[PDB]
Amino acid sequence: IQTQQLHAAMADTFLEHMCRLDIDSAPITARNTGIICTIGPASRSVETLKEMIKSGMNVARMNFSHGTHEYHAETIKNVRTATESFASDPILYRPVAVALDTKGPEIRTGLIKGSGTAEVELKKGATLKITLDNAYMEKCDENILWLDYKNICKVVDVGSKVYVDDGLISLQVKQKGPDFLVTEVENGGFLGSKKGVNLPGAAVDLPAVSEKDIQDLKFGVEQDVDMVFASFIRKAADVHEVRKILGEKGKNIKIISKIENHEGVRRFDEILEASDGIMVARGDLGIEIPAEKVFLAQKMIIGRCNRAGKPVICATQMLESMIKKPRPTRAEGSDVANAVLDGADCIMLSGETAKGDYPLEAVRMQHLIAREAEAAMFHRKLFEELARSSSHSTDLMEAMAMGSVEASYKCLAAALIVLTESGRSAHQVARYRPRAPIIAVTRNHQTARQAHLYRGIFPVVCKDPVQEAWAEDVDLRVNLAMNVGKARGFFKKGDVVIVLTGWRPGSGFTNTMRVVPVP
Amino acid sequence: IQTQQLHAAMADTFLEHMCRLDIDSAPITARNTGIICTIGPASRSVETLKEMIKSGMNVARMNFSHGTHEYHAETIKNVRTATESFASDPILYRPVAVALDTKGPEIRTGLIKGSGTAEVELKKGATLKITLDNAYMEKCDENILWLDYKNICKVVDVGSKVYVDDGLISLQVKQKGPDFLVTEVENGGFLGSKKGVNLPGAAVDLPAVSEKDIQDLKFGVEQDVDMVFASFIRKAADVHEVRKILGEKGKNIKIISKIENHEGVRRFDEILEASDGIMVARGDLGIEIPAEKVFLAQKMIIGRCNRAGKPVICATQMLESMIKKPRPTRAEGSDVANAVLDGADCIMLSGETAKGDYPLEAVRMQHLIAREAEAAMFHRKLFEELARSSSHSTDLMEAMAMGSVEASYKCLAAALIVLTESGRSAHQVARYRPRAPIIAVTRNHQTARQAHLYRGIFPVVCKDPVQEAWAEDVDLRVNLAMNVGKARGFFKKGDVVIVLTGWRPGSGFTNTMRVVPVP
Amino acid sequence: IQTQQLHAAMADTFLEHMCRLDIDSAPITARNTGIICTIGPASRSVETLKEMIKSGMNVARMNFSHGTHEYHAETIKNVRTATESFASDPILYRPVAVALDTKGPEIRTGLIKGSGTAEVELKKGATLKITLDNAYMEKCDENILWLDYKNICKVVDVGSKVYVDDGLISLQVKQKGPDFLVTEVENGGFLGSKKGVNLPGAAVDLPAVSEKDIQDLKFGVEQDVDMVFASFIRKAADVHEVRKILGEKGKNIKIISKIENHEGVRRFDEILEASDGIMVARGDLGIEIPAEKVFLAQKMIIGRCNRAGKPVICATQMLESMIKKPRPTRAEGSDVANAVLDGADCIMLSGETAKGDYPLEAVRMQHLIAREAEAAMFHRKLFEELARSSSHSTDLMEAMAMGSVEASYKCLAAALIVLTESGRSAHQVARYRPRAPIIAVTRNHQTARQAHLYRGIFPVVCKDPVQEAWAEDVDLRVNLAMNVGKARGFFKKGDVVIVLTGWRPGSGFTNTMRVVPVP
Ligand SMILES: Nc1ncnc2c1ncn2[C@@H]1O[C@H](COP(=O)(O)OP(=O)(O)OP(=O)(O)O)[C@@H](O)[C@H]1O
Ligand SMILES: Nc1ncnc2c1ncn2[C@@H]1O[C@H](COP(=O)(O)OP(=O)(O)OP(=O)(O)O)[C@@H](O)[C@H]1O
Ligand SMILES: O=C([O-])C(=O)[O-]
Ligand SMILES: O=C([O-])C(=O)[O-]
Ligand SMILES: O=C([O-])C(=O)[O-]
Ligand SMILES: [K+]
Ligand SMILES: [K+]
Ligand SMILES: [K+]
Ligand SMILES: [Mg+2]
Ligand SMILES: [Mg+2]
Ligand SMILES: [Mg+2]
Ligand SMILES: [Mg+2]
Ligand SMILES: [Mg+2]
């Protein structure tokens, strides 16, 4: 019984590959898919945070949707505190990234009967008037609803829908003024105060970044975050707006755009081009667009990112059930696996880690699945497809990247060691999706942290100073990776590995590839 | 307008590939397909030879079915003399392989009027008597044909047909003696000395290894030949014998089994596995089996050799017309093209160089077709298919070769540079069919002549003394390849090349790959 | 029991397909590729015609570059005579197309000694004068050489080369005057009558449609030819022009455009678009462009027509040898085979039948090889690729064809029977390249003759009155095919067949497909 689906690995057709999948074919230890964990009341603590890390957490996400700078900073603190707890063991030391997830633009209704706690019941078939007249900003009721968005009438059409409270309530626009909308309740319910609004299919003119947003971003810069997950990206311009706020001081910050609505879906190509990476924000996306179309968008985005060699995250509700249970639903298991199969670089956990009763279990779970799924990919066919996709380019690093993955397959290397500073060299390899882990040694901590964004990349920080011999310094670095993979269980002495390096110190890329034996 | 059929190279389907072939898309200057010339009267002179090498000859074939050991050693003499005429400028110096073509279990004709260059014109409807009277051994003419097969009497029966010169002449047995036969000419033609006789279906019993064969064999050793073309090889057993004869002294000689009979097609696989290479010998084959079937054999044979990764030569009648004519026929043009496209490591000239009036041109012509066909190959598909085929192998040098070819494809490398001594590394690379030229640098003159056997290797002798410093020595050899490609106009400064070298002296194989710019 | 390369028909890769071609795997009786024979001095006789038909000939080409209207008219005559000689038993009657091969924008020498069957030897180094002096027109010879082109002196410089007979003979201009040219003979050979002059790379302003062209055109319309081989078509405008002269009376004559120069190639697409079909005229082409490039043209061209769904012919020097020999060269056998694998709908014979010694053998040999090659095609991949191409298209008859072919493969049907009058349903099928024979039953003679143009169509002329009842009438015709297929040995009882018919009369196509057993 082969391991790591190597039997299906050898199939000719996709169908044959499936037919060959084997529950009894064990996968390797090394889990390539990055796991992003939302931190919160359930996971903030150091002790916990140490467990999260032990469980497989690669990225700590900060949901700026709630909490104060003072809170989040305290969260980052603990994260950083937890991470360093292992630093004492440069070998067993694992980098953890920090991400800032913007609150983003928002539309909110007013107060019900001047109260924050009151409610009304909207009844299916009724009429309901939306006004912009702040006169009513605290006089909402069964007949009148005031909202935040001054420009609404401009972006919505008669016959369109307005969703209130996470799509809990649905309204149909029957009349439009310059100041109000006249709707008809389709999907009734109780209405509380200050609920969220969604305008499915609307091209919203709300700014790329809120005022709050500008503030959190500057904050994220001062905090030295590794990426930013930018909410509500609808077009390239919005990415550029974010880029601009982060500015020169934060030009190294990775900006991940969140696709959460039709627009974003429809203008995805430009957004992708402008971004550093993408997050498929299923939550809103599934509110914005028909829940039954989310999967298409999900696969569209994943594929296109794969094709461009830009990182992509699958997020939201992956293991939802696990907020209350130790074991997920079957669909949950399915989802994570397909996501991985689709090509997702990272997968995410929100409620599950943030507030749920089984944060660690959710992590471990994601870990378990990803590994299985990772073996189950159809690499030969995938590599082939990707290669065609990129055929337009004759880049050298890419050539180095393709040649090295191809050899890792050929001799079934146990790993690929890439020495990089910027991470570019490692990134090129990841994109060609080897099956073996990519252990990338760098002296740049940030590069190391950010590496997680990418599938298969396992960052290893070199904390030693530079030797007078390049060659020697290189050799060393290489050895380091070697002690790691060994310490990790990726391989053993005698195993074969693909080693990528720069020929000289001004190389510019890993232009030197080698097949080597583990000591 | 792209060069080197690169548009076509981009194709998704074979059909599309074909469709984009462009007469205006120009080939590169490096001809990858080895050219095998049969040296005889027309080409024996040292002066012709020189012109021969210049024009493209990589290997000299000495047909032991013709001339004497005396005639052949002189040939070999002018051969090495002409080659060696170019050893001053190590840059433009070219190795030229010497090959001995075996007699084997064949039936041969005597001497037309005591000239091994003599000929006579037979007529349709005429009578001819075949005798065994040695008193006619050197006395063949329009009226008496002496054979060398004693039993060919009990082997044929009246009404039968006897074929002379690869079916050139068909004789019908009309009267039987005990010492001879009287036949009638079924079709006219000329008639030489020492032509082969085929009795398709007949039951001749000829040892796999003539006394002569050993004679010839041991002479070849005496002459330091590089390889052996073993005529009418029928089984693997036949192969081990020759090997046995060659013995220790020639353990480095390469045995190229010649498939020229139904048995050899039939036992193809075991022969293959025993041989060092194969030769599709169509002259004989073409009479032995149905003409209309030769292409099957050919394709089949080419396919399994490539699949197997061993050199295959496609031989005989390729440019036939040109024995008398300056320019070939369209079918000959097609023939050569297709053979290259089928996958031949080399193509051959027989009557074309050994005794036609347009030998120089013939070689020339092969060169032209070869370049053009090499470009029209479907590298991308071929590589995928080859990879598939070798999938059970996990060989270290194969990984290296595959990564190399792959990179080379990606960046459109100008050449591949391999530093080898056995020349195995090189061999391995060529098996994956790179589009670029492989410059094979070696301090071993045999390995060097031998490399011609394989598609795309441009062997280059390194005559320099061995450097104390492994890296310096390496660089040494590298530059020499750098210089040749430059000389031969293979690339320029700022052109990119893949370099295969060994990490440490006595590295085993070329375990190091680099992308490098041409100096 | 191995048959029709069915094992190879199951390979996954092109490589494995090749690897599995078996000489011992016998082909079926039906020869799919049509055989075109140039009818000349050596094949004019009725008695010779009868054997050629018998021999596999489907079309006769009458070369207008040679002879007179009268000589050709008689040939037609004889053609039709040897044909209907078989009309006795409609089961065994085989239609024969009559093809008009045009003169075109060509330069042509004169009569060698008022003959035309006459030849002349030219020796190397000798002198020859080219003249425009009509008083030599029919008096050519070793000394004097008259030509078609009064401007030739303006179009060629001293030192230049003049090619006679498709490059057979190279003449270098030594000196020129107003009237004549003074050349020296560069290579020896037989110079015959009304030969071809190729002034490669020289501005000849010849007209697309000569008045003579015109003349001949009109002549063949009266001669009721089925098709036209338009020589030297350079651009679509040429076609329209031919089309133009064909006018109304011949709005049904198939115009087959011959690509025999650099322009024709270059403007191939629009040509193809305008023409009914294409010939690869390698004789002229091969001298018009570098010899080494013809296979590129041929492959690009055959591929493109396949794609298009239009019939393509591979022509010239396929079995050249056989003008004098009974057995072809290796190179020639590979060429016909390779032509068939390339995808040519038809193959041709020129000198081989027109004037050679072995007309019958050449034919048979084409028959022989084709069959073998038809088998060897990789039908599976080919069909997929063909589909990939045709994908934009949603034609109804195309779907029928495809489904039908698809079904034919699956159940290994013995044949497809198509009932058609226009012939289009049958072409549509032929274009999707089933392995099995298309028995095209029709009541249109012309249709039945022209069917030879298309790969795999076996035309059957139904001679019986129309049935009042469609069903019976259809049945009958089906019956016809059955009998014929049975008498030709295509299938036996209990064999399976695919049946293509129309539901109702005047169905515009065969919209009904059925799987049937032979009775
Ligand atoms: N050394 C030579 N001496 C004289 N004639 C030679 C020589 N080598 C080749 N020839 C001539 O060229 C012809 C073709 O050469 P080739 O090597 O193909 O020989 P072959 O008879 O056709 O035998 P084989 O089947 O082994 O190739 C020979 O038949 C012979 O007439
Ligand atoms: N009608 C004919 N009368 C006599 N000889 C003929 C005739 N047709 C063909 N031949 C001979 O056969 C040779 C080859 O025939 P073919 O039809 O191929 O002519 P061709 O000269 O090569 O010109 P093309 O390029 O049109 O094919 C001709 O050159 C001619 O000598
Ligand atoms: O913001 C998100 O993550 C979402 O909406 O899913
Ligand atoms: O022996 C050969 O080379 C042949 O028969 O073609
Ligand atoms: O006309 C032809 O066939 C040619 O020129 O090849
Ligand atoms: K958020
Ligand atoms: K021999
Ligand atoms: K013509
Ligand atoms: Mg959201
Ligand atoms: Mg020979
Ligand atoms: Mg032979
Ligand atoms: Mg022509
Ligand atoms: Mg011709």
Swiss-Prot record, chains A, B, C:
Gene Ontology molecular function, alphabetical: ATP binding; magnesium ion binding; mRNA binding; potassium ion binding; protein tyrosine kinase activity; pyruvate kinase activity
Covalent cross-link Glycyl lysine isopeptide (Lys-Gly) (interchain with G-Cter in SUMO2) as placed by the record, residue numbers: 103, 254, 258
InterPro entries on file: Pyr_Knase, Pyrv/PenolPyrv_kinase-like_dom, Pyrv_kinase-like_dom_sf, Pyrv_Knase-like_insert_dom_sf, Pyrv_Knase_AS, Pyrv_Knase_brl, Pyrv_Knase_C, Pyrv_Knase_C_sf
Binding-site residues, L-serine: 58, 94, 452
GO cellular component: nucleus; rough endoplasmic reticulum
Phosphothreonine modification, residue list: 29, 183
Amino acids binding substrate: 61, 258, 283-284, 316
Top-rank taxon, per record: Eukaryota
Cofactor: Mg(2+); K(+)
SUPFAM superfamilies per the UniProt record, alphabetical: Phosphoenolpyruvate/pyruvate domain, PK beta-barrel domain-like, PK C-terminal domain-like
Residues that hold K(+) according to the record: 63, 65, 101-102
GO biological process: positive regulation of cytoplasmic translation; positive regulation of sprouting angiogenesis
Region (Interaction with POU5F1): 295-519
Primary role: Catalyzes the final rate-limiting step of glycolysis by mediating the transfer of a phosphoryl group from phosphoenolpyruvate (PEP) to ADP, generating ATP. The ratio between the highly active tetrameric form and nearly inactive dimeric form determines whether glucose carbons are channeled to biosynthetic processes or used for glycolytic ATP production. The transition between the 2 forms contributes to the control of glycolysis and is important for tumor cell proliferation and survival.
Cross-link (Glycyl lysine isopeptide (Lys-Gly) (interchain with G-Cter in SUMO1)) at residue(s): 154
Modification comment: ISGylated.
Residues the entry annotates as binding ATP: 63-66, 108, 195
Protein name, as recorded: Pyruvate kinase PKM
Keyword terms: Acetylation, Allosteric enzyme, ATP-binding, Cytoplasm, Glycolysis, Isopeptide bond, Kinase, Magnesium, Metal-binding, Methylation, Nucleotide-binding, Nucleus, Phosphoprotein, Potassium, Pyruvate, S-nitrosylation, Transferase, Translation regulation, Ubl conjugation
Positions of Mg(2+) binding: 260, 284
UniProt source species: Oryctolagus cuniculus (Rabbit)
PANTHER family reported for this sequence: PYRUVATE KINASE
Enzyme class: transferase
Binding site for beta-D-fructose 1,6-bisphosphate: 420-425, 470, 477, 504-509
Phosphoserine modification, residue list: 25, 85, 88, 115
Note: There are 4 isozymes of pyruvate kinase in mammals (L, R, M1, M2) encoded by 2 different genes: PKLR and PKM. The L and R isozymes are generated from the PKLR by differential splicing of RNA; the M1 and M2 forms are produced from the PKM gene by differential splicing. L type is major isozyme in the liver, R is found in red cells, M1 is the main form in muscle, heart and brain, and M2 is found in early fetal tissues as well as in most cancer cells.
